[PDB]
Amino acid sequence: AHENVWFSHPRNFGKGSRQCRHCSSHSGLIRKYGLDLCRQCFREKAADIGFNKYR
Amino acid sequence: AILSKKKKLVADGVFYAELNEFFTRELAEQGYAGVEVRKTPSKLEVIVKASNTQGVLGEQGRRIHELTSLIVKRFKLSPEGIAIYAERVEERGLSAAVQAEALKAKLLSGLPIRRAAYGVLRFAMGAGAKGVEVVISGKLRAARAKSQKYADGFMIHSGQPTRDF
Amino acid sequence: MLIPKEDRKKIHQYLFQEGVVVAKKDFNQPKHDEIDTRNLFVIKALQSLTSKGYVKTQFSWQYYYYTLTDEGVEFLRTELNIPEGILPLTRLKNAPAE
Amino acid sequence: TPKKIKHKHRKHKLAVLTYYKVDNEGNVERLRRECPAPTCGAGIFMANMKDRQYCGKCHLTLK
Amino acid sequence: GQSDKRELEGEVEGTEDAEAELEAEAEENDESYLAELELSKQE
Amino acid sequence: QQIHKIRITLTSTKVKQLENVSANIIRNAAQYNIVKKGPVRMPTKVLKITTRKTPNGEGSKTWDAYEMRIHKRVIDLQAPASTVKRITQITIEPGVDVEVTI
RNA sequence: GGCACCACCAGGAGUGGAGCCUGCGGCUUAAUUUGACUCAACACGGGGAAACUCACCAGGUCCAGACACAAUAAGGAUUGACAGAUUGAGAGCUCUUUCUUGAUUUUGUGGGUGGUGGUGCAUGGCCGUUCUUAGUUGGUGGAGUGAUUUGUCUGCUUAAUUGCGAUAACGAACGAGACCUUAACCUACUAAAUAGUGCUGCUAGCAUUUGCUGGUAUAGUCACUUCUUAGAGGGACUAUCGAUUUCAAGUCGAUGGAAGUUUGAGGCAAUAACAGGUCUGUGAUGCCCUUAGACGUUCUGGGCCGCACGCGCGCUACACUGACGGAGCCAGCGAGUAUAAGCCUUGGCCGAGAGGUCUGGGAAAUCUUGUGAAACUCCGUCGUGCUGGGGAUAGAGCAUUGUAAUUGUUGCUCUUCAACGAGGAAUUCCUAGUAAGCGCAAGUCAUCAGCUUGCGUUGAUUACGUCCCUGCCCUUUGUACACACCG
Lengths: 55, 165, 98, 63, 43, 102
Ligand SMILES: [Mg+2]
Ligand SMILES: [Mg+2]
Ligand SMILES: [Mg+2]
Ligand SMILES: [Mg+2]
Ligand SMILES: [Mg+2]
Ligand SMILES: [Mg+2]
Ligand SMILES: [Mg+2]
Ligand SMILES: [Mg+2]
Ligand SMILES: [Mg+2]
Ligand SMILES: [Mg+2]
Ligand SMILES: [Mg+2]
Ligand SMILES: [Mg+2]
Ligand SMILES: [Mg+2]
Ligand SMILES: [Mg+2]
Ligand SMILES: [Mg+2]
Ligand SMILES: [Mg+2]
Ligand SMILES: [Mg+2]
Ligand SMILES: [Mg+2]
Ligand SMILES: [Mg+2]
Ligand SMILES: [Mg+2]
Ligand SMILES: [Mg+2]
Ligand SMILES: [Mg+2]
Ligand SMILES: [Mg+2]
Ligand SMILES: [Mg+2]
Ligand SMILES: [Mg+2]
Ligand SMILES: [Mg+2]
Ligand SMILES: [Mg+2]
Ligand SMILES: [Mg+2]
Ligand SMILES: [Mg+2]
Ligand SMILES: [Mg+2]
Ligand SMILES: [Mg+2]
Ligand SMILES: [Mg+2]
Ligand SMILES: [Mg+2]
Ligand SMILES: [Mg+2]
Ligand SMILES: [Mg+2]
Ligand SMILES: [Mg+2]
Ligand SMILES: [Mg+2]
Ligand SMILES: [Mg+2]
Ligand SMILES: [Mg+2]
Ligand SMILES: [Mg+2]
Ligand SMILES: [Mg+2]
Ligand SMILES: [Zn+2]
What we know:
The structure is cut from a larger assembly and holds chains A (about 55 residues), B (about 160 residues), C (about 100 residues), D (about 60 residues), E (about 45 residues) and F (about 100 residues).
Chain A: E1 29-30, E2 37-38, H1 39-43, H2 46-49, E3 52-53
Antiparallel strand pairs in A: 1-2
Chain B: H1 5-26, E1 32-40, E2 43-50, H2 58-75, E3 82-88, H3 96-107, H4 113-126, E4 131-138, E5 146-153, H5 161-164
Chain F: E1 3-12, H1 15-31, E2 35-41, E3 45-52, E4 63-80, H2 81-90, E5 97-101
Bound molecules: magnesium ion (41 copies) and zinc ion.
The structure holds one RNA strand of 487 nucleotides.
């Protein structure tokens, strides 16, 4: 009944199908190399992940 | 499972970033400095640097044992595949992480900013730092916010050496 | 929350014996992968326990880190009617390494 | 739309009295054609609703 | 610290905290029945 | 399962430890009379990510350009399988991972 | 005084003029969510929204209100429910309906918790701007009762407070420069069966001279590192020689050199500051609002695209230095998957196409891939004509993705074939592999790139000067301002 309606809409292959690892966001996601992080969350973790600015 | 070379090195990096913040939230009060992940055959050595190595292994190492179990249950690691060691930072004054966390525990005690700020300027130099500068920004009883700067000694600003020293 | 007594039990014999619990933030997940019940049941059951000072809760990167207080071993000692030989698994006095 | 009210449980006060009868100096009566599904069995009775009989454990109706 | 005081009595008070803590910490370094079984004994 | 043409693949982000492990293995493959091929410098892979600087949407359109380098080297050895594995444990380095395929 | 293509000069390409794409305002709306308004708002919020995203609109569910109490409560506090009515709905949402579960829980009190609700004028962090301009600071000494000042300057020079020099200053620090990354050189080392080559086995075609083009080769268990890759080094320091100059810092010419504009390009980047922008990135936050008829969250449908209009970032073009039609046929930067939830996809076979199908390769210098790309070149048709330029608008039909394409996602086929005949006042960008064309890859991404971030192909005209406009810095000056002219 309700369990068959609650959260019933498909939530795959979409922008709402995925989220940031750190800030559960839907906008500004980075999917390269399987990061799955918001673009804002990436900046605050880039040094920790191993991404540095050289050029 | 089968992970490409480009994504596998990234996954190891992503693992470090998420693990480091977990320690920052849990072991903030023990002057957590940083973490070193020493991969090895048949074991995953993890080295945590903290100001206080009594908290991290409390009550017959209750905390480190109950804390290493929290990592086996979240990353689906074998129970024997990870071992956590707590190592003392030798020179606390040269670690800005310890000095900033130490500052937080004093500011939250209602202590004046000036007493807290001069407490880290002199503590860093005593450990032998070439220079140190502390900036504190925010609101304190007053509605308007302000930022203060206490410099000391020699500080460099531009180029590669800021990433080195 | 309305949890069957049996599903609440499995949450307690996972928290005791490995006095730490990790839960991903998804409410509609069928199985918390360690406790054969809904993942949401684990979050709300332990939100009460941390609400009543029996477990500490830490949250980082959309993950829950539940750890059992020393006060909580005594609580499950009596309510679960378990033998008074406790030592969940974290409190096995395994001791660290120097 | 007008404000709605959620449904509230409606007993009978001892609904169970009607499920059994006692023959003077007897044995069990078994009045409400207990469900034959493996889920239920004894103690789970059908429902003398109308042109159907419902058991609450496994949601099924008869005739 | 918006005054000639509370930073004066902030410096000498701030610095004596570290000297006491550097020395205390540098001295701190110079010196430094199971369960599942009970669930199975129902034989 | 005796002598074996064996390939060892080395990948890491940092070249100093990669070349030390690479040189240490070549050194240990010298005093031991083994025949070897390498090290072979594979084309380095530049993992580049270009984001916007602004967390919000205001200002001059300024971008970060983060970088990651993956250097991969493969060395071919002609030795029995038992011998090569103990060389790996001798020249174990936390940063560099090793995969060995026959 | 000085510097500067976000200023000009000499010039190039343009934009503004047309159509369309897209953003902003406005109007409209049931809602057309919202931030941003000169540079520093308007292809910006990585904002290319069919659902989600989503915050808006019209409706419909759930508590996922922890916890201490109090009440109710096993003689049952409460939860799930077939069938029919009801509903957009096979939502027990609600109503008839009696079945089921069992102290988990229902009601009241406090207390919570959650908000893309408000406040960026309460804040953290981050970011943009003054400004990447060249500026900033202290010790000792001189001056001053002092706040302060000199040092930090007439001149020359430089990209530069960067140097020469003058000198009540002398000797220094941040910033600049140094530093880091990338591109160009090394037949000198180090090696490479995931790179390439000559020989050599074996092999094809053509002329027969033994030659020229190929294929094969993971055992030829060959030779080599020039081309390819990348680590250790080397190499440029304005070197030598001419001119000028205070004979100083330097500058301009030659010669050598791979490189002689800081060798080219970037990354980092000082003292302060702005009510600059974000609480619509955050399980970052203070406070206010809301919290069961929710502003939480979820389902269905619509909207963010809506159209008498003004403005900004762009794409096709207005033709012949061209359109087509055949033929020739060269890059670089990169990415790529598993019991998934499906990646990059060659090769074969169908189909005019779009596309479909069967196998195989590749977690990758191995396979897609030499990404055989486009401008471009050769030969033809066209022949100054709103023409074969241009391809909107629209009709009919064929495929792909997706639950779902209607307000056409996109692609293909035929047909229709509009403005536009080089654009007023204005205004933008730019100095060498630069501008301009021309495409390709990566991000977004189930599908959609007229967008950005990069990459390479073809490849110039015209300066290498100045303060005339514009902006900024310095010096002098005035000041009744210091919340500093938003006075
Ligand atoms: Mg205080
Ligand atoms: Mg420096
Ligand atoms: Mg520099
Ligand atoms: Mg987090
Ligand atoms: Mg001009
Ligand atoms: Mg714009
Ligand atoms: Mg939608
Ligand atoms: Mg919806
Ligand atoms: Mg919402
Ligand atoms: Mg929030
Ligand atoms: Mg701010
Ligand atoms: Mg002085
Ligand atoms: Mg003086
Ligand atoms: Mg004096
Ligand atoms: Mg200077
Ligand atoms: Mg071979
Ligand atoms: Mg440079
Ligand atoms: Mg502001
Ligand atoms: Mg503002
Ligand atoms: Mg937004
Ligand atoms: Mg609602
Ligand atoms: Mg809301
Ligand atoms: Mg919409
Ligand atoms: Mg829009
Ligand atoms: Mg519309
Ligand atoms: Mg722009
Ligand atoms: Mg154009
Ligand atoms: Mg042609
Ligand atoms: Mg290739
Ligand atoms: Mg052509
Ligand atoms: Mg025509
Ligand atoms: Mg045409
Ligand atoms: Mg057309
Ligand atoms: Mg003209
Ligand atoms: Mg102009
Ligand atoms: Mg202009
Ligand atoms: Mg779309
Ligand atoms: Mg694309
Ligand atoms: Mg865009
Ligand atoms: Mg002027
Ligand atoms: Mg004055
Ligand atoms: Zn995020």
